């Protein structure tokens, strides 16, 4: 819980290299305990627009910077994240509730996307084109768009802004994050890590807040003629209000929306790897991410088998309580309102024809817990307005063919991740490709990888991080004519 | 004005491989002459929901073909193009009144954007990355995005339709053209060919219509659910407007908003060449265009010779009429709103302090001409909300420095196309690097190309066309994770 | 006025067995005096749900208690 | 700016200072005229704005544009 190094564990905002309290504060509890974890500054729109102004300046000054320079900045500062990783663990614990395992797989994740992107920086290339004229050269140059407001979820408080940020800075522009108010925390490990490593003041800038001013300083960020670029990774309705914002003065703008994600097993489907894919997609971080598969479309020859092989794995694994304790596997869920989404799922589909095969209730330890839920007999209408209901509830839905389960899955308008399990060497090509999402697991239930490209198709989203694609979100192309020759 | 292939003269709509009318139309007139030159479908909300439907329907075939066969089609179209020529350039100085020259030159330009895409089908390449799991493999597949809604201008009627149109078909994309008002003809015209050359039925669809249904039809065809894709180029104002729309629904969007566009002549500068690209760069299409340098930043020591140089060379090319005319160089403005713009623009100039060197005044044809300007002595402060007052006029500012001349140009928050003249090769590179703009054109004043990338920073727009970076304003990235290993 | 037992003057909110800080505080003076007393947190409708909902699941296991 | 647009003559630093935040050069413009100093009457910073005359009756009239007087 603590023992941690206090300038790890921080309060106050981080603006032009400098740690500024607010008029205002905010409490931050661990979800699973309650314990307050601490008062946050709760930024206001005055200190947005001051954290702009620090990181438009801050911009000047560090696209001029050489890349290799950028990138040995990038890689201190990840050096710095994997010489804290356990105090960082603890940190993503204690304000997002998960296991310590699973926190330690995010903090080296974080870490790797700004190892990443570091490398990605002295390989920013522009291109020499052949046009027909002899009196002129065509030259393609890359620069970097300016400065960025970057706006995560709470799920993976350190991974999201890193993968963002890293992408951003690599590219030579400059950010202002704004950390979700339920784990601002792992955003102010970071700045104290960024400023061990020497970035420079103002690239780095975070700027916590509550719900009360969370549209306020959203607004004022995403509106700021100083900002250029708009990253948000969270609801849909936050997003497309951000969409809005960003019209006005027509700003870059890339986003990856919550959203459900199918996890299709077929009949030749090797059942014991697709349950282990099915526990390691649905019940990670208690089933609270946007690439957690929530509905699965099982076939009718292997369902049964499924099913059951399912639930004994889940008896078997899933070990409710708290991230801290040893053994604990299922975390609690991020607040109060958040169980009782889980509730009105599950209720309004046993209610509707679904058949409990596993807990479904609150967890005997109460407060956030709820009991990892499996329901069978599961149908399609049976989703409508849960689509943004994250938790430890896998609904199992029968198909009888592949069109079939395709055409479940494809129910879109919404495409993040999808998932299938299949020996067919062909049939995999088929899904892979008619799979309407941004990102495709086959035979496997945990596909992160920085050097992968991170998306949404069709309202899930716009463009992509991580992966050789990451770095363009934060560059502009200038076509140089380079005449009179 | 006549003798026209009856074919290429079209007056109906084009949906779904059928030439259909509306209950409704609306009048074409030669803006030179006045001459009626036809009577035009006029598309509302029903006949655009219609077409969308008829391109949505036709994607899910195209897609499905061969990109080595979308790209054969794409040639065919090419060649009937430049088959065309005299007859498609006739009809772009009819209802734009550019002088049959430069009508002659838009053809070759629009057919060469087919011709371009067509090459580069066959080259949308997915990728292997290396992770470092063994159990696993990484691929990255990209594919077209869907149906996309293309809104153009005037100014080029068929090389602004070809730029993005070739992309999304090239990319496996279906799309709903919607024509500006003022130049429907060259759009219906490429209908026609693309009917010669085969292009499936539903996969190139315009709908033309006036400023009645603009506004309705605009929003139907951004915000109807089938449709994933935006391209429009014109005024920032509806930009705006359709980025709204687009916000709603998360579609991808690419524009190139209308703007300002420096052309700075340095005292190192080769005073012919620079005339010559002054001449260029300001008269071409009369000065209607959003590359269209407007304002000239000269140089103190080159100043004087400069704008005599640069007057006498007006008088000795620019000879006003009508378009179909021999010698003719100079057309008609749009319409008699634009001629105000110039008359506002030039009149709140002297009044403030400018010097009209040669001719201010409407032209002695009468109507809609206007005579070639060039007033020196202005200064910034005297083109505020005329950014996007588009005519044969040519503002001279003298500046002392080269960081002087910088700020200006860099006055900001757009940035399309930018040029300059100058014989030092540093400076050369530091202007050119400097420019906040999309493109920058160095000793040359014309610098069109269909394999360069177009577009702006900041609110002159999103995404660029042409070039190999054209094809991905179509295109969704899938990644791939192939387990099981 | 002070040399009291630190355990005994509070200023943050009780709840489930947990002290907790709110958002906002308020001042507290001797009536007498005037001399500030300390800052208290100022619990607002979220935290009140947030007590009542400690006290309903303790009540699930308090009631159970013997009354011994 | 409001002024060098409308005629003045900056003789020396007219924009932020290099140091950015808060600092500004120090500046002095001339060939500045009285019409330039509206709804700036409040606006205090390292500016000089220098107004050349011909008289002393001239001198007071412009001064004494009062309502004013500090």
Redesign the interface.
Not at 457 to 462: D, E, F, I, P, W
């Given at each position: 819980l603590a023992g941690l190094s206090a300038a790890l564990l921080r309060t106050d905002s981080f603006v032009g290299g400098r740690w500024l309290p607010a008029a205002?504060?905010?409490?931050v509890?661990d979800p699973a305990?309650?314990?307050?974890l601490g008062?946050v500054a709760?930024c206001g729109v005055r200190e947005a627009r001051a954290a702009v102004r620090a990181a438009y300046?801050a911009f000047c000054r560090w696209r001029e910077v050489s890349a290799k320079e950028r990138s040995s900045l990038l890689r201190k500062w990840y050096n710095l994240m994997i010489q804290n990783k356990d105090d960082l663990a603890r940190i993503i614990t204690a304000e997002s509730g998960k296991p310590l395992k699973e926190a330690h797989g995010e903090i080296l994740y974080s870490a790797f996307f700004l190892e990443w992107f570091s490398e990605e920086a002295r390989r920013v290339y522009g291109?020499i084109?052949?046009?027909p004229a002899k009196?002129?050269r065509?030259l393609?140059?890359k620069?970097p768009?300016g400065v960025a407001a970057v706006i995560t979820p709470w799920n993976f408080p350190s991974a999201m802004i890193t993968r963002k940020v890293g992408a951003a800075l690599a590219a030579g522009c400059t950010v202002v994050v704004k950390p979700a108010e339920d784990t601002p925390f792992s955003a102010l490990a970071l700045a104290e890590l960024a400023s061990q490593a020497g970035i420079p003041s103002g690239v780095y800038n975070v700027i916590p807040c509550?719900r009360k001013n969370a549209k306020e300083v959203g607004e004022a960020i995403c509106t700021d003629?100083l900002v250029?670029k708009i990253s948000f990774t969270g609801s849909?309705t936050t997003?497309?209000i951000l969409?809005?914002h960003?019209?006005?003065?027509?700003k870059?703008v890339s986003?990856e929306?919550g959203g459900l994600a199918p996890f299709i097993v077929f009949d030749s489907a090797?059942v014991d790897?697709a349950v282990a894919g099915a526990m390691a997609s649905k019940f990670r971080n208690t089933g609270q991410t946007a690439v957690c598969s929530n509905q699965f479309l099982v076939q009718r020859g292997i369902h049964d088998a499924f099913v059951k092989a399912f639930a004994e794995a889940m008896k078997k694994n899933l070990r409710v309580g708290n991230g801290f304790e040893e053994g604990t596997t299922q975390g609690p869920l991020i607040n109060?309102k958040a169980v009782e989404k889980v509730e009105k799922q599950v209720n309004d589909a046993v209610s509707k024809g679904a058949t409990v095969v596993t807990g479904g209730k609150r967890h005997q330890l109460?407060?956030n817990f709820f009991e990892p839920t499996l329901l069978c007999n599961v149908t399609q209408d049976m989703l409508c307005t849960h689509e943004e209901t994250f938790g430890p509830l896998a609904p199992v839905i029968k198909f009888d063919t592949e069109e079939e389960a395709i055409a479940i899955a494809n129910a879109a308008?919404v495409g993040l991740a999808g998932y299938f399990?299949s020996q067919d060497p062909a049939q995999?090509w088929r899904v892979?490709?008619q799979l309407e999402?941004?990102?495709?697991?086959?035979?496997?239930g945990l596909?992160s990888?920085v050097?992968?490209?991170?998306?949404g198709?069709?309202?899930?989203?716009?463009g992509?991080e991580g992966?050789?694609?990451g770095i363009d979100e934060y560059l502009?192309?200038?076509?140089?004519?380079?005449?009179?020759l």
């Open positions: 205002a504060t905010f409490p509890q305990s309650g314990a307050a008062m709760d300046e291109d084109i052949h046009t009196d002129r065509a393609v140059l620069q768009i509550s003629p250029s849909t997003g497309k969409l809005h960003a019209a006005n003065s027509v870059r986003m929306l090797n790897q109060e109460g407060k308008d399990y995999i892979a490709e999402v941004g990102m495709v697991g086959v035979n496997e596909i990888s050097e992968c490209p991170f998306g198709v069709k309202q899930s989203g716009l992509r992966s050789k694609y502009e192309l200038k076509y140089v004519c380079y005449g009179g």
